[PDB]
Task: structure prediction
Amino acid sequence: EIVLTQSPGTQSLSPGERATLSCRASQSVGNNKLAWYQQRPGQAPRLLIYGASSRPSGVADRFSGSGSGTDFTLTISRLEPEDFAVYYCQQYGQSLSTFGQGTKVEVKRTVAAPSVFIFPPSDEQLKSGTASVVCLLNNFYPREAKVQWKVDNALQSGNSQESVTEQDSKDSTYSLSSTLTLSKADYEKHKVYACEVTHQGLSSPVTKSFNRGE
Amino acid sequence: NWFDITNWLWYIKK
Amino acid sequence: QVQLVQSGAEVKRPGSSVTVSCKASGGSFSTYALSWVRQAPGRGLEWMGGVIPLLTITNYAPRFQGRITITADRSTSTAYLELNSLRPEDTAVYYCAREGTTGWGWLGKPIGAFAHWGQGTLVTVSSASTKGPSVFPLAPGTAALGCLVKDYFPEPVTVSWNSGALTSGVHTFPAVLQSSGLYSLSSVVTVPSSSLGTQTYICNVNHKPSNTKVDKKVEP
Ligand SMILES: O=P(O)(O)OC[C@@H](O)CO
Result:
């Protein structure tokens, strides 16, 4: 099986900058049967390059493929706004076709610390016997961020879930939401609910908290 | 290479 | 122009078998290679296998050999993917893809690489039953407010604010799959603090499978 390595898995680049994406094969790819695809969230993949360097009609000529053997490169001469997306290489030089794990090309912008908000459970939800506590980390860059829940200063584990938006098309930031879930009965055993946030843009962690009932 | 089969078909049909 | 149209999303029980269909129009169906590629949520593309309809010759990735069947029906220009013994890790968007051609129309020399893609079919492997969400407020310089759309199945839900009049500063997060097997989704928006007394914020939530259509006013 030919393993295709796309490293790095993410590139942060400025609008208008040149991009070069590497795809290395664990063994020679027969007849240069190497393709590149673009994929945007919620869309099917789109063929950009086939046979290492051939470009289908309709594909912008700012995309070019090069390389042979084990060493392949996708070059984007100048990043347009729509070029920030995920790129996959694929080899089809053996009956077993394989894909690289993809490289996300995302927009580099200035560092932005998260703006943090915490939300107690609603009265409506509490009536139903469950408590969801929500923490919002809004409009931060770069994407790496961490949230920790503390309940009466006890570090929580296993009772939260989080998810992250796609990079904002307008200001190139990310947001993250984390939800802590307890039964109403367990929620009512504790006073202080806190979420603690770390990020490159913060010199020290930010904690937002509330006291249950107040 | 399974991937080559349709090229061969195309050729021999031409 | 070649068009590939797939069958609709389907929820499947663990251990069951799923059949996904892909109906082609334009170009030649019988003499071009049709493949299936899947994408698990938040993960990469994986080639599963393919068929060349004229010759009834299949080609499966070793990882799926013994668990999949790909067939082609020339009378309807439809290709089929069978995937058996389903497990949660088979939850994915399944794509059919046809190789491109050079030229110069859609009947030229084949290129092997996948130029033509179906719209995808979401197969969700789950024991859960259809359930409508509850919609709870996230009550509010800059203030944040939002709605928590909790405990629904299957995907998707959609959320707008003020019937679509409010989009600036709105962030609607990807759903999370809870231990219960039900999804939860949060949508938030930031607004000026001064606007809280005077402007109304309503999250419009739509979950079509349960016919849950809720407009929740979020207030301090
Ligand atoms: O400052 P660095 O080393 O990038 O750390 C970022 C990390 O703290 C985000 O959670």
